[PDB]
């Protein structure tokens, strides 16, 4: 069937127009709603359509958030439209289709008993940090960073952050739910019940993604909420009283047995690039303010190879765009631009 709807450009306009699409197939289904894949008639371009049930007397956070964003490492909202039980309204987010995920790529290497090539680890993580620098600059926190939410174009190695259904614009003083983020990637302050956390929970989750890419498996595979901390404590040891206060000021534990951190160099396999372990240690900190900012993470020595004029993908292809920074993306530390953008990148 060819479906024709009236839809508003994501950016916008925003003046509604007719959009036609076909080859509709279900690719996802959960308690969030359904995701379809489809083909736009004018373009032949593939799209994913995320159908969600909407309270028609309230506004969608994910829509409002998605409308603000325009970045080469974020899934683009092309259109949105309303459907569809009688008085039931559905919101439909029309997104660019991206066929692979960092999850499925890493799992292929994992099942083959081998590690993802270092160059890809640099590429994917760097593009992830860029997307985070961008969304954080509006005060938006993603709140669900994990490999399944990192889309990959298998040929060009472009990464796009997706699934803003947990995302929120964080306002200081105004509390936020603590049971958030997938368990393996959940920052310790959340486990401790923090409601006054910051965007730096995304950096923790990005650290977990990094460590996972290095190990071939999740660094903190908790069987539950409490076990998630057990897992964290096996690597980082117990937090100090000053780290507890930094994570959640409203939490007090007067007596507990203190455990020393396990050395980072033993967490990872012997062959693991020391610079990856160095980066990881600056992301997986108990103290939220001690974690690197995404921009800081981008400027780290570990991504030096990406700033090299002669760099290439293992498939011979040139790497995707890495240096097209905007004032918005650089706003947390504008001077950094001269390190992030190498001499050979400038027009």
């Amino acid at each position: 069937k060819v479906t024709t709807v009236v839809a508003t450009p994501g950016q916008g306009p925003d003046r509604p127009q007719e959009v036609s699409y076909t080859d509709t197939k279900v690719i996802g289904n959960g308690s969030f709603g359904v995701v379809y894949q489809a083909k736009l008639c004018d373009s032949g371009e593939l799209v994913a359509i995320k159908k969600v049930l909407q309270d028609k007397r309230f506004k969608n956070r994910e829509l409002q958030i998605m409308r603000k964003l325009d970045h080469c490492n974020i899934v683009r909202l092309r259109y949105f439209f309303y459907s569809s039980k009688k008085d039931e309204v559905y919101l439909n987010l029309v997104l660019d289709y991206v066929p692979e995920t960092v999850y499925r790529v890493a799992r292929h290497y994992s099942r083959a008993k081998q590690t993802l090539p270092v160059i890809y680890v640099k590429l994917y993580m760097y593009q992830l940090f860029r997307s985070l620098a961008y969304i954080h600059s509006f005060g938006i926190c993603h709140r669900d960073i994990k490999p399944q939410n990192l889309l990959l174009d298998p040929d060009t190695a472009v990464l796009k952050l997706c699934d803003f259904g947990s995302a929120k614009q964080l306002v200081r003083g105004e509390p936020n739910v603590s049971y958030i983020c997938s368990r393996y990637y959940r920052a310790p302050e959340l486990i401790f019940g923090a409601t006054d956390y910051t965007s730096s929970i995304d950096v923790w989750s990005a650290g977990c993604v990094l460590a996972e890419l290095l190990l071939g498996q999740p660094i903190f595979p908790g069987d539950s909420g409490v076990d998630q901390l057990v897992e964290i404590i096996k690597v980082l040891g117990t937090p100090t009283r000053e780290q507890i206060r930094e994570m959640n000021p409203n939490y007090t534990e007067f007596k507990f047995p203190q455990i020393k951190a396990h050395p980072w160099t033993k967490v990872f396999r012997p062959r693991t690039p020391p610079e990856a372990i160095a980066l990881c240690s600056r992301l997986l900190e108990y103290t939220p303010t001690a974690r690197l900012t995404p921009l800081e993470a981008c400027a780290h020595s570990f991504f030096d190879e990406l700033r090299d004029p002669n760099v290439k993908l293992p498939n011979g292809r040139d790497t995707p765009a890495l240096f097209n920074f905007t004032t918005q993306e650089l706003s947390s530390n504008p001077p950094l631009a001269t390190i992030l953008i190498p001499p050979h990148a400038r027009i």
Partner: peptide, 23 residues
Amino acid sequence: PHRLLQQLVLSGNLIKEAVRRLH
């Protein structure tokens, strides 16, 4: 550990209990 985690956070026993579960 949902109601368990809640109890643990409210009672001030999280680290104590996590440490115990370590061994």
